[PDB]
Design a protein around this ligand. Structure first.
Ligand SMILES: [Zn+2]
Ligand SMILES: [Zn+2]
Lengths: 114, 48
């Protein structure tokens, strides 16, 4: 899910369980700091990468001069009936050519795909 | 004998009839429209 470091020793932390209370106790191995695992999760791996690119498309690409511009498909939060589209261009992320749209208002940027 | 008959090649051998040009332009326009259609399908994700 993530990764945590010390509170007083500025060092990286590994996972470990409690022999007595039977709880995942993230404990420093370079030092003697411990904490209870609120998440109760240790590892996750999305090998096929279902995670859509929308989580990381930057908003300022809209004001790139060289991309296309389409009048249709107005934005949701603001009407602003003109936006830009461009393919994923991300090798191995997914083999779907779904066009990604981003609104081109000065302060907007609500992104969507359809 | 070719001295008598003679052979040549020129612009007149490269110009075609106006009807031919119109048909050729129509064919090219139809092909461009068809590829626009298929790329539109690919963009909208229906090209199986
Ligand atoms: Zn330590
Ligand atoms: Zn917008």
């Amino acid at each position: 899910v993530g990764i945590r470091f010390c509170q007083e020793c500025n060092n990286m932390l590994y996972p470990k369980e409690d022999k007595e209370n039977r709880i995942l106790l993230y404990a420093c191995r370079n030092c003697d700091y411990q904490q209870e695992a609120d998440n109760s999760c240790i590892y996750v791996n999305k090998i096929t990468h279902e995670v859509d690119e929308l989580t990381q498309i930057i908003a300022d690409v809209s004001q790139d001069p060289t991309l296309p511009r389409t009048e249709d498909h107005p934005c949701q939060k603001c009407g602003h009936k003109e936006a830009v589209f461009f393919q994923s261009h991300s090798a191995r992320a997914e083999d779907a050519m779904r066009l990604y749209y981003v609104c081109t208002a000065p302060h907007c940027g609500h992104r969507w795909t359809e | 004998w070719l001295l008598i008959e003679g052979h040549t090649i020129g612009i007149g051998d490269s110009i075609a009839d106006s009807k031919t040009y119109q048909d050729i332009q129509n064919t090219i326009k139809k092909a461009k429209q068809d590829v626009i259609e298929v790329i539109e399908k690919a963009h909208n994700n229906e090209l199986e």
